[PDB]
Amino acid sequence: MTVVPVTSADLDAAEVSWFSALCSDDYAYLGVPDGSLRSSFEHCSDIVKKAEELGFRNILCPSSYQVGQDTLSFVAGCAPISDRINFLAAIRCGEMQPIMLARTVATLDHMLKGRLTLNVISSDFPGEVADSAFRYKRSHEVVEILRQAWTRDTIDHDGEIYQFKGVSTEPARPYQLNGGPLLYFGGYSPDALELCGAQCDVYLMWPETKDQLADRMRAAHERAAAHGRTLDYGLRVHMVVRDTEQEAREYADHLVSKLDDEYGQARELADKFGYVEPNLWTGIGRARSGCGAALVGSTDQVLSALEEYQKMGIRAFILSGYPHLDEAEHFGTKVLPQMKTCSLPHAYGRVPSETPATPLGNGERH
Template sequence: MNPIPKAPAIRSENPAVEVSWFCDLCNGDYEYLGVPDGSLRSSFEHCSDIIRLADELGYQNILLPSSYQTGQDTLTFAAAASQFTKQISLLTAIRCGEIHPPMLARTLSTLDHMLKGRLNINIISSDLPGTQRDSKTRYEISKEVIQILQQGWTRDQIKFQGKHYQFDLPSDPVKSYQQNGGPLLYFGGISPDARTLCAEFCDVFLMWPETEERLADTMKDLSVRAASFGRTIDFGLRIHLIVRDTEKEARDAAKQLLSKIDIERANDIKHRALDSNSAGVLRQDDLRKSADPDLFIEPMVWSGIGLARSGCGSAIVGTPEQVYEKIQRYIQMGIRAFIFSGYPLIEESKLFAKSVLPKLQTINFAEAQNRKPNGIPVTPLTTGERK
């Protein structure tokens, strides 16, 4: 293998990592890619089973995605899940501009209190369903929404004068349960505007699978951008898993996943997603062109999933030992958060939790960064003076 790329400046020097799973709220769980199975539809029951199991298995966090597809509304589902989960944090996707920002802040405050600090936020800047804005405008809106949220969580008054939003409002209705800045913000986007937005305002930059060299280049660029704002950030990787007892079994499972694929139908399914033409997806599609005949872009990273799925398009494929070693390489590169998934989601979460997860030194970012309080914080929704 090639030498491990050098880690850039990061916020969390502790090598412990936050390990997350993925909950299929958006019609994307399969046994065979591109072949819909009614038993794996994104019903409330199926999505609840996924998140309950991840909670029981010890994952620290779970991504609740957002998309205009058959499935579950992100915030509605998160509110319900707050009542039947115990320790897992909910990484809740928010599409900026979808909800009036002060009311979004109020919704997130309610949810953060319901979860008693187990809320993380995935900031999304893609188009709203049925609309199309230029990239510059989308990131302007996202930047303003983030600033409004952060003012509400950390100041006595929301006083904001931007290009798209102007507000002068008291912040009591939106105070978060979490302290020292409110819920952590996770963000992914490969364009220059996206990178600058994350560097200035967010806490974790999420990447999709690429070669180690390309990931390292992205991380170095983001680290330099963050430093220009006097900040450091952490880095996360969203990637699928195929873990089996032997390498042959793992590779066979990858082939089986594609064994019933109809490329035309798979392409249609892929382009239902709102991000299917984003710079990040197109970049992964381009990278797959340089893969070997078995679709590996580098040892143990298989790009076949991107044939039938938008977003994250590759998986770590191998034995428990190989998968663990690959994760350790990523950790040495400076990656401190992982959002894993596999097909089907329930079965693969069990395999990874049994064979690899116990070997990893794990951490909860919100606790480590003093966002999640040890006791009940004083807020307008807890013990603060009622005005």
């Protein structure tokens, strides 16, 4: 069947997401600063606007100290302007004070009538450096707390890094039910699995050999099962999709074309930046934009690959092209229509239909 048991087993669809590129991540030629495509609100919202326009059911919103929009600001920016699309908010644990994060989570959740998914990154703070051990221990206690806000009356958490005995959750009650919003995050180190295992609702994978992926999927599930839980499974990958393959390979070679790479040329080139699979091009990795591989192929090639990834159990896709605008337009008109899509929160059953009996909703105000 599926590589491992997946929480959304019986689901005959998948969440096909785009990318807001809030961290000056958008480009015309990779390595080439293009003024048109700075990560400004006008632009980045245009993406969300066009992404929703085309029927993408979520969009990742990254968070780093680069020129661009603060995640949570941008989400709230777009909340009024959006109708249908879910948001995937990057959130560095410890960055905003847990209880306040808990609130902001709620606030947004209500701003979006449930269309929210916190993505829990655990990296170093800007201008700060503390070791993995702590950073995860921290990101643990922060989710532990967010979870209390969403489930309990009162926050009672006596940790190594944080301590809260008896803090009303009324300020921080979210739109979503049944344990609160969904958490899409990954991690490969044991520490980052333990977390993806105890607390991932979704587990993200950066792109690899169809078999290497299986191994990740197992390695994750093993840790999840020890906490008596099943995960769902998602793929971050880039995208170059056209009618014809010799059009896609062409554009792909156009994207890196100006990049003054180590391979910009005793010329014994070890070029292990070629097609690790039929349609999985690791060449894009010669601009280390985080995602080091891209689906490249005809409409039908891409569609088949995603249909395969789906057969395995990968229930979410977090796609991203260059430009982020134009490439969403392609995949949108071409591949999207031909998938059965969903919103994981709607399926997982967290979002209610009419505004709920919350403090910020239809509850008794005390």
